[PDB]
Amino acid sequence: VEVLEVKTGVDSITEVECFLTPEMGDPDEHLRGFSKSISISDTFESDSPNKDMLPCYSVARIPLPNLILMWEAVTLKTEVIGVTTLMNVHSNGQATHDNGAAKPVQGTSFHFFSVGGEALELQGVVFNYRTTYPDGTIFPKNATVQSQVMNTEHKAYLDKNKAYPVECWVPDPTRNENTRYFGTLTGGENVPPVLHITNTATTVLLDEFGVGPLCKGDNLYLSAVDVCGMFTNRSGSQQWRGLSRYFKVQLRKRRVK
Amino acid sequence: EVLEVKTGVDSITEVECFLTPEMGDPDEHLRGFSKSISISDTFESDSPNKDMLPCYSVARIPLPNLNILMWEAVTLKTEVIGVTTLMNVHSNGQATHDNGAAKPVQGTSFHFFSVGGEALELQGVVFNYRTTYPDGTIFPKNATVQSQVMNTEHKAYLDKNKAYPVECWVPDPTRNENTRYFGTLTGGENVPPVLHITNTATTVLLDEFGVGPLCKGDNLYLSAVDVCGMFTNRSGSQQWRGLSRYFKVQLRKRRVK
Amino acid sequence: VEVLEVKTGVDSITEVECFLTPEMGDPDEHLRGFSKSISISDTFESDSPNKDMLPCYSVARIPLPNLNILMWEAVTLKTEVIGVTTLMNVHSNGQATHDNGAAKPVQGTSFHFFSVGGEALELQGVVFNYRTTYPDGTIFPKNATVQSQVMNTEHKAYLDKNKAYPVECWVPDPTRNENTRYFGTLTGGENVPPVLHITNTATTVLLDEFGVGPLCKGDNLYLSAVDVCGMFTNRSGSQQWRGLSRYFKVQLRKRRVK
Amino acid sequence: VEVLEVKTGVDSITEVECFLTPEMGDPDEHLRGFSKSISISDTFESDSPNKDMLPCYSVARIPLPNLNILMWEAVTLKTEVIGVTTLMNVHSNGQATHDNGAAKPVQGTSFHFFSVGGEALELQGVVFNYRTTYPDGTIFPKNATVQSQVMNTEHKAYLDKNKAYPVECWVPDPTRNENTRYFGTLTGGENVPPVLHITNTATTVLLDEFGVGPLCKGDNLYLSAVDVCGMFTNRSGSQQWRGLSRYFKVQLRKRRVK
Amino acid sequence: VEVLEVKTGVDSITEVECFLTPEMGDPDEHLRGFSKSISISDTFESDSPNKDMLPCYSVARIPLPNLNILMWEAVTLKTEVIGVTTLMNVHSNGQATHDNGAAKPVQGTSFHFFSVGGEALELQGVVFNYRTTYPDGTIFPKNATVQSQVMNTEHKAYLDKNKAYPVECWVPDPTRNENTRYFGTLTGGENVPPVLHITNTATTVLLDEFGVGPLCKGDNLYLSAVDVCGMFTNRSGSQQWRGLSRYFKVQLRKRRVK
Ligand SMILES: CC(=O)N[C@H]1[C@H](O[C@@H]2[C@H](O[C@]3(C(=O)O)C[C@H](O)[C@@H](NC(C)=O)[C@H]([C@H](O)[C@H](O)CO)O3)[C@@H](O)[C@H](O[C@H]3[C@H](O)[C@@H](O)[C@H](O)O[C@@H]3CO)O[C@@H]2CO)O[C@H](CO)[C@H](O)[C@@H]1O
Ligand SMILES: CC(=O)N[C@H]1[C@H](O[C@@H]2[C@H](O[C@]3(C(=O)O)C[C@H](O)[C@@H](NC(C)=O)[C@H]([C@H](O)[C@H](O)CO)O3)[C@@H](O)[C@H](O[C@H]3[C@H](O)[C@@H](O)[C@H](O)O[C@@H]3CO)O[C@@H]2CO)O[C@H](CO)[C@H](O)[C@@H]1O
Ligand SMILES: CC(=O)N[C@H]1[C@H](O[C@@H]2[C@H](O[C@]3(C(=O)O)C[C@H](O)[C@@H](NC(C)=O)[C@H]([C@H](O)[C@H](O)CO)O3)[C@@H](O)[C@H](O)O[C@@H]2CO)O[C@H](CO)[C@H](O)[C@@H]1O
Ligand SMILES: [K+]
Ligand SMILES: [K+]
Ligand SMILES: [K+]
Ligand SMILES: [K+]
């Protein structure tokens, strides 16, 4: 794939604008955006989380106008949608002290997004190799104790929505040359969410040679995780809470050989 | 079609004003404060009182009558007014320990401002779709479980002061081409306020093509939220505390086709 | 005044170097730099802080070499909080953080503020609680109404007197102050750790977007400061604000005006 | 070595891509990436940590294509911590943060460190407590004296063996290492939250102020790392260090030397 | 001194490389790098710290190659705290953070400070409490008055002796020190986590706004440091300051003066 000149003319550009909903587990008909309450196994070997307790990666494959030319992704604007929902501190949460407001959403967060010309490539890593991941999820198979640090057998494509659990997969840094990805894990049970919004910020997707992701088969791949923290119920039980992510991507036509 | 800027001394003007916060104002003595926060007994029964809900602030400022020319907003200076009030730790708050001073205002904050040539466009998102928002507020209608992450039916304009609750609306990232907005949510009950003031900092409002918000009908729209945290009363009850926001906007005349 | 050219050559520049002591309340002959211990009113309506419990803005007016139209124009500032290491005294009748521990250090709500101007800093009054009774001997927002809790434009003043304007009820007026440059940070929370940087290598430029610094009316330079570092906790649990002095070095040049 | 011109042409560049596994102690066949539970000595004098309780430096010596005078010069690095999302497993024999809550996540003291060099990382020994008896199967500061608690120039070593040099008693020697680029952050405190960023868009340039990167003696590239992310607390409250692997991609070019 | 041109040629540059050990109090033969456990006086007036409980500034005077009019001009600095990983020893007679947990790590109030000059660092005395009795064997502000708690211009000194000038009662004098560059951060709070960065890729330029570095009078370079990292808590709860050494590498060039 030798990359040649960019096309010009009114017809040579296009935009993709959409949102990815979060996939936190959705334990019942009222709990879109939440996981099942989190329970703790008594031993490493008995860790067997329910599917509805596991946040998963979000992904959308977006068809582009049919076109050798390829759409090249050049810029991104992105935003977490609904940040102010975390100000609801009145909905049967757990009072921080006698007569106080409910404890707000807080604790471990993972905020991640990617834009590529093909599926995000994943490497499996597990906290505990004896965790049994549930039916309906796609997970590192044949996990060994080495899978707790690095097992090169665990290679996958993020090719299905609400299927790849966040905790056992990361972007594969050995691959992904045709994707740009960005993430932050902020740990701790008390860490405060810090969520910025603005319509004035643009990320340039071009690599060090001036080339953006090139869309194979005229498809653009967007992926996201926005686990904002956990909601604490009055009882003390805790559920992951997630939010949607907005994407606006500008593309141009690029000739290749 | 945006054409050239008009020059000459007659071609520039300035807007200077402040927006007061709209925190709920539960009685005649409590401007700047919400009603004390109560917690529902069940998730489904969440039903906040109007005076417990901080709302977006908005001001529409009339500009010198033109006429096609339009005022174009170019720069902003902005500041929270009265940051030092949070040093009042002697006004029947809750002692941090025996014989100590009162706990200062702290916890969840939302600091937000926008400048636009028309009303800020809003997208509704709710923490809990079974929350009953109260009479006298404008809130996402026909909320469903999908409203907890993204329901595109919930579109609105910030066109009325003390009416749109902060917790269920955000700037719509799919619109707002003629507005510049900026916000930060910092969550957590112990989050310290960090408030900077200076008259030496300017934000440039021009987009990537060198064009600022263009003021339709010669009106400038300013919006803000500055929920600084919660004040904790001696009894333990907690009220949101907000402050006013200063705006200085410089505008120039722009020809459009 | 139209601002014309800068004057060059011998005697066309000068420097001001000084320090401003903090005004925290000074409740007795031994307690310069501290406030009185903070007490809490029994009701919201009855808030009535004693003068010696209220930190105040510091101000100094510095006479410049007499001119004459030429005016002194403030171009750069170096500034520093003086005595930052005093906060390492954790052995002087404080409250142990746990059994056998060192004393809790100074921490909690801070306000670090400084300004340089060619005239008095202009202030806007805002009060946490409009029914607070501010004490005799302080200058405070008069005829406060419930609107004063958010913004009452009647409360305009000049920082024209030292140890008089309480920090908690006045801020720089952003609608004025065109001939002053001001900078401040409020960091709230009872446990916030002080973070205090010192260096003699950092310079702030005071020139506005047109290349013009504060122009000193009557050949006087106005310097203002607040450096409430936090609270000291006594063994008994009582808390006192603690402040430190601020150093200023300002370079000025002569500017012709019409 | 006098440094002369860079070689050009298709054959003049090469790249190294690999990962280094963490070496946290691996106390049993199920606990790769963890240390043994941390125990506390009764006295300073009796401090005597078992090997499987001591995280160690990771190192790989990577042979490069043979050249011989030309040397491979390391010019850029991309690096990443692998498996950051594993820390979201808060359902696996941990300790509930409060009644009915999720498990306490990995948190507390972290050290994130990496280096790229044309020879082994040079180390200086420094010990918290000179009376610590370091265990069989580790390489540690020898003939430690009280001065070893601050600086004893006898403790010089090379990071030349994997899972051997304990993190707590060795640092990069700032008096040497001119042919290595190293970077590290120790973030202390028992409750500090991990903050782990990932991206494939960030490059670090390895060139010094003269435009010269590490030069690979004998055509070997030396990569070193520590990524102690914090401690995992199990249900009983016992704590174990948890580490993760680090990815490296290094671009190199041929450089002539005399 | 009128500053004229820089000398060039291979012989016109030199380097100083060294380390300064911390001076934390060293209460016994086994506790180099630590202070005595911290105690708390029963009244503000009775504060009377023992010498071994007080960290002091470190200083080294480094002779340079003899010149005479030429002076050595300090141009760049690389500096690093040595032994950051020692803070990973959480198994040595500390206090478990909770049942079965590891020892609480070094944390709480830190002061990290360094300076490079062509003469002794100039100090200003400021005291937390003017009634503190500083011990024999230290050099401290004399004839302290209540004003010494904020600024008493009598307390001027030179940092001209090791193990002598307590950190808590002296700071760099911002009204002087024109021939020195100094940098420091006080981070307060009993639970503040240490954040210690190491790298050999970072250089600080020591030139002022006129392109002139410190000029070394009598061909001596003066380096000063404080690196109080926090406090170590022993099993009983008693707390001691812990410090680490600091590396300095300074590049100098010959400068003609009149
Ligand atoms: C306290 C408890 O039993 N927790 C169970 C959980 O039980 C459900 C519900 O508990 C809560 C909770 O965890 O505190 C109430 C809370 O308001 C809910 N929050 C939200 C945002 O929806 C959560 C949440 O739905 C789940 O945790 C998600 O997994 O649920 C109980 O109050 C409820 O109690 C019923 C009794 O079981 C029943 O005998 C009696 O007739 O009626 C009461 C009241 O309805 O039961 C709920 C389950 O049916 O269930 C989860 C299962 O995922 C766990 O077992 C928790 O431990
Ligand atoms: C303690 C309590 O009853 N709290 C009620 C609250 O009652 C009001 C007031 O309480 C406080 C409080 O919440 O602690 C006192 C506090 O100083 C106030 N703070 C400020 C900044 O104004 C708050 C605040 O105004 C409200 O929380 C705002 O929503 O209010 C009580 O002290 C007061 O008690 C009176 C009795 O009602 C009355 O029978 C008796 O004769 O006199 C006492 C003393 O005046 O009543 C206040 C209400 O009238 O009310 C709120 C609802 O607004 C909640 O019900 C709290 O739970
Ligand atoms: C314990 C007590 O009675 N406190 C009241 C106080 O009495 C003081 C003094 O108490 C202390 C205190 O704990 O508040 C002792 C402290 O060491 C001292 N600290 C410093 C830095 O000076 C403080 C301080 O002087 C005041 O709090 C400043 O306002 O005082 C107590 O030991 C002694 O018996 O009487 C003293 C009064 O002369 O007084 C304050 C107001 O002045 C309050 O009334 C306290 O409740
Ligand atoms: K299992
Ligand atoms: K309801
Ligand atoms: K009153
Ligand atoms: K031993």
Ligand SMILES: [K+]
């Ligand atoms: K060296």
Ligand SMILES: [K+]
């Ligand atoms: K004394």
Ligand SMILES: [K+]
């Ligand atoms: K001076």
